Ligand binder design. Structure first.
Ligand SMILES: Cc1cn([C@H]2C[C@H](OP(=O)(O)O)[C@@H](COP(=O)(O)O)O2)c(=O)[nH]c1=O
Ligand SMILES: Cc1cn([C@H]2C[C@H](OP(=O)(O)O)[C@@H](COP(=O)(O)O)O2)c(=O)[nH]c1=O
Ligand SMILES: [Ca+2]
Lengths: 132, 139
């Protein structure tokens, strides 16, 4: 008889990190300027589902490095991620599924864009901002 | 200066007939034995794709099963039967008219009759691929 052997599915998307092909090689990217709840926190599954749909349904993904630091201390490419023109970082925050975080000079070009989205999500008391 | 946008592509765990799995401690792309699934730009591609993704993403236990002939195809893909909680994905897609039996070679054809049988049945119910008129006309 043939023999069954274990294996486990690879995950490209893990919270604020996504594994993409860049310059013909795989690379781990960590979304700039945001902090998304983990799968075991409130809104964590919702934020994962939103990211998955946004990125898997994109014909075109682009990354935009900022000017201050290309890679964090853990080897992750720090970037804004675009799915068919729309910034994933911004969309999450707009939907109240991520907060603005890790904002540092040099790597904070789109900070105002994100703070604007966050203000709107808080005013709407949406998702993360629905809690007391 | 404005920042510049650069291209990249999503790394896809599931893509057509291929699945990327961690196997003996290392990542490996596998090609499902004995089947041909429509690609995402072809009809039922997004369906066959969703059914695969459902089956495999929701599995608690994934297994691979190599056959007795070629282990790796000429594109560097491991050739295997893929199981999700004990149910073979290869067989399931064929039974659900979401893939055709194909690429059947002596040595790597242990499950040929199981699948051909599933394909035979799949036509009669006329589901998905086989729900089109004359889709079973061998064109
Ligand atoms: C987003 C981001 C995170 N980080 C670091 C800070 C955290 O390190 P410390 O854990 O050592 O405090 C970590 C959070 O990433 P994750 O949220 O992916 O874990 O990544 C940066 O250094 N720069 C950044 O721009
Ligand atoms: C299933 C299978 C495919 N292949 C090859 C045949 C096709 O090569 P050609 O492209 O040269 O025709 C290709 C189809 O794979 P995909 O259907 O995943 O694209 O993989 C094998 O060599 N052995 C197999 O067992
Ligand atoms: Ca195919």
């Amino acid at each position: 008889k043939l023999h069954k052997e274990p294996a486990t599915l690879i995950k490209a998307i893990d919270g604020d990190t996504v594994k993409l092909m860049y310059k013909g090689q795989p690379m781990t990217f960590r979304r700039l300027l945001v902090d998304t709840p983990e799968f075991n926190e409130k809104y964590g599954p919702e934020a994962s589902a939103f990211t998955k749909k946004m990125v898997e349904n994109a014909k075109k993904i682009e990354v935009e490095f900022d000017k201050g630091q290309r890679t964090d201390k853990y080897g992750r490419g720090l970037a804004y991620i675009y799915a068919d023109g729309k910034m994933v970082n911004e969309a999450l925050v707009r939907q109240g599924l991520a907060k603005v975080a890790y904002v540092y000079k040099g790597n904070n070009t789109h900070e105002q864009l994100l703070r604007k989205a966050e203000a709107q999500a808080k005013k709407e008391k949406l998702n993360i901002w629905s809690e007391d």
